[PDB]
Design a protein around this nucleic acid. Sequence first.
DNA 1: ATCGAGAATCCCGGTGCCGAGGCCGCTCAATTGGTCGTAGACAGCTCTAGCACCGCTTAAACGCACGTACGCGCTGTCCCCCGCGTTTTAACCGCCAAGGGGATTACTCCCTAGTCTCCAGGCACGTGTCAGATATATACATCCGAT
DNA 2: ATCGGATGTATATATCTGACACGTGCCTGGAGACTAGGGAGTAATCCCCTTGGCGGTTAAAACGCGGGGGACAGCGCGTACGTGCGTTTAAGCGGTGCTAGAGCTGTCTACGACCAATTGAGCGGCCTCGGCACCGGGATTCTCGAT
Lengths: 86, 86, 96, 95, 99, 98, 108, 111
Amino acid sequence: KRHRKVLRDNIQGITKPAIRRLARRGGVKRISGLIYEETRGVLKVFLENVIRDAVTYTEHAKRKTVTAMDVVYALKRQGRTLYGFG
Amino acid sequence: RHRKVLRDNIQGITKPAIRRLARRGGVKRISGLIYEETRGVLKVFLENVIRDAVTYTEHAKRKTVTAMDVVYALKRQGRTLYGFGG
Amino acid sequence: RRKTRKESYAIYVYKVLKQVHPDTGISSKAMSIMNSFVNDVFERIAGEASRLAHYNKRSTITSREIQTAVRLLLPGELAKHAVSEGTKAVTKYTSA
Amino acid sequence: RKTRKESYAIYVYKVLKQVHPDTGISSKAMSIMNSFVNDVFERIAGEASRLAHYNKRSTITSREIQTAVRLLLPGELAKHAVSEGTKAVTKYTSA
Amino acid sequence: KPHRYRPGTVALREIRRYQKSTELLIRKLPFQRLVREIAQDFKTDLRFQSSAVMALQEASEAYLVALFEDTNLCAIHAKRVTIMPKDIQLARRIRGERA
Amino acid sequence: KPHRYRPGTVALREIRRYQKSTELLIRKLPFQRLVREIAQDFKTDLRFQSSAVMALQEASEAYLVALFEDTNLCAIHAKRVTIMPKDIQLARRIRGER
Amino acid sequence: KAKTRSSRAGLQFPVGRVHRLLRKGNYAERVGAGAPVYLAAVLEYLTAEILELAGNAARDNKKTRIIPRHLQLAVRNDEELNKLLGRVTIAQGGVLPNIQSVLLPKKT
Amino acid sequence: TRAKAKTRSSRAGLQFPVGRVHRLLRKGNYAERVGAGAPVYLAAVLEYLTAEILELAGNAARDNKKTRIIPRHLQLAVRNDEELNKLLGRVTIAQGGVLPNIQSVLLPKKT
DNA sequence: ATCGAGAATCCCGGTGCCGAGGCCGCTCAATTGGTCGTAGACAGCTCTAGCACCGCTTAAACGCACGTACGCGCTGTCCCCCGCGTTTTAACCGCCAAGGGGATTACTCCCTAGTCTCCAGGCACGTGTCAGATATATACATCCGAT
DNA sequence: ATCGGATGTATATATCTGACACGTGCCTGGAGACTAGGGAGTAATCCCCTTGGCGGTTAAAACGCGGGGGACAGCGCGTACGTGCGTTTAAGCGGTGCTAGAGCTGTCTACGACCAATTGAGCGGCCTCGGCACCGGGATTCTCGAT
């Protein structure tokens, strides 16, 4: 069985309190109502660009497995370099 | 001789010139102390660009700064400018 | 003793202008802007070919790396027609 | 067999022994410093590349690295880098 | 005698905690399914190393967090203390995000 | 007689003109003296090509003009039609210029 | 036994000059055969539609010579050419006529 | 042969690999020729930078009561100097978090 | 106006355990030592292009008045979001299974640096127009009172 | 809410003038026809590391329910800056002069790849325990509802 595996929020995953937790790491006191759907949209656009660029690095080596060097390199190219993986 | 009373180069950026650049930017009305901060911001930007251009010019050991010098210096700061070569 | 020179793209830019709107000219400042434009894109794509070859333990820039690097720089539609013209020129080259 | 991999980690550990000699460091922080040293290394390496390309040269010497450090390092960070750099060039050259 | 502190003590105290802590917030399996779902569009039947999923998690939280930093400065610059979606649209436009 | 105009017709028509035209509009000798006087601090007894002074003029107009684009969107986002120095400070912090 | 002509390239854009510029910029140690053909094709595409949009947007000013104003709005009107060139200033370009809607004087 | 088989870093008085950095300058296609004493200079610069960041993470490492540098101390170690932040202003470092910043209107309006 | 529940937060103490640090073999990349064409410091000219100077016109900058409209503080009024108990529910965790695909090592071989010569493509250099700025005179498009 | 000065702005027409599209000449870099070592496609295997499933607990998510404070529209009042006209005034122009230094070309030379033998040095495998968690108990501090 799966015991209610219906992920439901196809992409909502980033629950409402999860976006609350990231905003409160950012130093944000009060959050309006429609913030969450737009936040899912912005995160969706950012991930679409980042792994659109990362999957091309995985395709150029003709490999079927995305690695960590893949996405750190593709993050570097977009001017968002992220240490701690290579 | 011909009146040369021209002290304070920075002030030479006239209040109508800052008005005119605001008019090209699409700014309707300009407050009071905008001009002081405008000369300051322009001063900071030209200080960085000129510092990097001089660094580009001392390395060739040449007394004369060219235009390729400063198009290179604008390229490196992520502000690339065509129309002068390179 | 005459002097030196220094190449450009201006005759070639003039030729593509003659391909597209042939009875319509071009001014010189715009010619030098197009010149430094194609040098800029040339260094972006050649640079991305360097950073892309510098990952796969390879030291050779074939056309396929230029295909991937164009599919990383140019966004979307003109990436599609750009890469499609690239296959047109590789295949149109070697079939001769 | 297993392919050998390089790093900087024992060198970063050695400078840690120089600065605060009785003080530890964690492993992911060591990989942070490793990727930091690589990142700066390709920054001034690339600045040496095009900065040497502009002057119609084909050689990277220490004057080029001095210029490129005076482009990336902000100010006070440039000066002591150049003082340690000239001290290491001359301190090398005296042998 | 039930009595909640107020609208702001949970907020500011919890800002002190979630600024003070270090770990990664949004949960592992829904985020992992998200990256795989967006990944299915450009190519079918991919595979991920786990640390790469942690990497997309880390850059994604840092980009959102910086976006809330800046949209917080936006809405405070309206003499408001509440993020509203047009402020998000402003910082994405001011920064350059707005394509 | 009065004829005059509203405070804003000369502004908006002026926006149509100065958005419409393209030429260089900070005067060339005060700007040139400004670049030389800023240039004297890092090194002395300099010489400039003229087109380089044109190029720094282009960086000045591009960076200032774009800064009024984002500053104007900042103040419009306060339901104000007049920019003020804190808005300049806001767009400079948002672009990361501190 | 060298009974041959000179015609070879027969395509578009200098394959040899671009090929020189790939070999003499220290990118790889070695550069394959088909690559400058590929990169030349891409640059002729990009050049072609940017000069085309400067062509129609040059005819809208009823001229015959494209000036850099036409390259300014010719780039900044399409989305994709703008996103390729969003960090690039064009000299003697100016701006597109963007006017924020709150500045439009309304009334009866 | 032999000739006092010595290395280098001690020929310059440093603790960075001149040979490994030197090989990395020759093998990334940066210039067809690479000079005599260039990675001596560059290893000096990187030793200074490494010493600065690890120094400030050491000071913050005592000043938040541990005996071991974690990447959190690299986060607020780097982000507290101005110039090290300006070199690394586009760089996220993982498991870093945020240095504690609170805007003035959020702090309570008490008496 | 100033004082107590009480709840969250900070201060020691044993535990554990495991990840930080260190030690022992050990392949190989640094090292040392010669060569060698050559990239480049170095000298000197040249002429050209940057800097200096002086007089004239004047667009542009400067400065005074003025008024209204833009900023901004107070007031009320609503509601959306913050806070907290209650359910649930799906994420986390341990372990067990299977293999598809990454990494490795080898095999074979086509291919792209490298050479030398051959020539026309483009590029420096006169040149003279037809495209555009500049008046120059001329009828619309919309602004702004005043009705 | 319409009408008219008026007024800035769009619409032919000449007109000089000069910037660009173009023709002449040249020279060197594109190319063409070879060779050769090596980078890399290509096969096969090793195994490991990604995926998958399944059960057990449960921190977190969802959700319902107060309630108040934060967004926001109105609104009055000040001030500062946009508009426009007289004054100045130095920026642009436009020529004239002088020579400092970019750039060229040649000279001569100290220096980086090429091999090629020699070796310890950093790296992986493999221990080992002390510092950070981590409960676990306990006094401090701060907040929030009272005076």
